[PDB]
Design a protein around this ligand. Structure first.
Ligand SMILES: [Ca+2]
Ligand SMILES: [Mg+2]
Lengths: 119, 167
């Protein structure tokens, strides 16, 4: 989150009025809460999985500009983490297919699996 | 005798007695062919493309050596039931890993109209080879469904194969 937020809120980038709404089922620790309290006016957090359409309507993903998915690079199974990202893009496209998903994969064949989704 | 009724309640059903004003198997019920060969039923993509299959049945399987044996004999039995004719009997092709197909072929040999395509059910080229478009019904089965312990893997393959076929 820190490496993402510095690149997203950097002075060199044009001023951004866009807010950032996180969504993660694990409740954050005190240091992540302190990071949110730092970038208070620009970021909000909301606990929940992405595999719940009630959670997606709660974070207003249909009214959201673009969804982003950050993959765990350092994982013990580069296919299982790939699979979790697959299921996340599946759930977001199942709720609202008219949204822009910016995600990150771990191989090249998984790009075809992403292409399998109709939207 | 007794009458099998399909009404919406028990009390509605409780009105009938109240208101009164070789070519087959060794048994007969199925079809049996001689034990064929795994090399006879393995096809390649070009051979399956030249094999014209219209209205047929394709079965997708996500099986491996670590996966449990599903058991497909119960699946393929009422396809070869003798309530139709041999010309009416559909053709079946199995798409998946040849390891799981070898693990199950020792059960799967006494049945006609059965092919095997080793490969991957996610392969769009393999689906175009087996003509899923003309295929009457694609059946997507999963074998690793009771060894994986996560919704992320739970039916993940089945969902991908369905979405690829729809796309
Ligand atoms: Ca009822
Ligand atoms: Mg705010």
């Amino acid at each position: 989150v820190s490496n993402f937020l510095k690149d997203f809120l950097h002075k060199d980038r044009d001023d951004v009025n866009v807010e950032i709404v996180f969504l993660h089922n694990i409740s954050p620790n005190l240091e992540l809460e302190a990071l949110f309290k730092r970038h208070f006016t620009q970021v909000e957090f909301y606990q929940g999985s992405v595999l719940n359409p009630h959670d997606l309507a709660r974070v207003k993903i249909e009214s959201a500009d673009a969804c982003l998915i950050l993959a765990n690079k350092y994982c013990a199974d580069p296919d299982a983490e790939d699979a979790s990202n697959i299921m996340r893009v599946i759930s977001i496209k199942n709720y609202h297919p008219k949204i822009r998903i910016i995600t990150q994969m771990l191989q090249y064949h998984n790009k075809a699996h992403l292409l399998n989704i109709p939207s | 005798t007794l009458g099998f009724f399909i009404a919406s309640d028990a009390k509605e059903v409780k009105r009938a007695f109240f208101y009164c004003k070789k070519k087959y198997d060794s048994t007969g019920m199925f079809h049996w062919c001689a034990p064929k060969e795994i090399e006879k039923v393995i096809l390649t993509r070009s051979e399956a493309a030249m094999t014209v299959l219209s209205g047929h049945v394709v079965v997708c399987i996500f099986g491996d050596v670590s996966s449990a044996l599903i058991g497909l004999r119960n699946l393929v039995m009422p396809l070869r039931a003798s309530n139709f004719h041999y010309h009416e009997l559909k053709h079946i092709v199995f798409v998946g890993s040849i390891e799981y197909l070898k693990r199950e072929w020792e059960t799967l040999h006494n049945f006609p109209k059965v092919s095997i395509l080793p490969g991957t059910p996610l392969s769009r080229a393999d689906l175009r080879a087996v003509n899923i478009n003309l295929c009457d019904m694609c059946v997507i089965l999963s074998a690793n469904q009771n060894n994986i312990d996560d919704t992320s893997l739970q039916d993940k393959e089945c969902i991908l194969a369905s979405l690829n076929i729809k796309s």
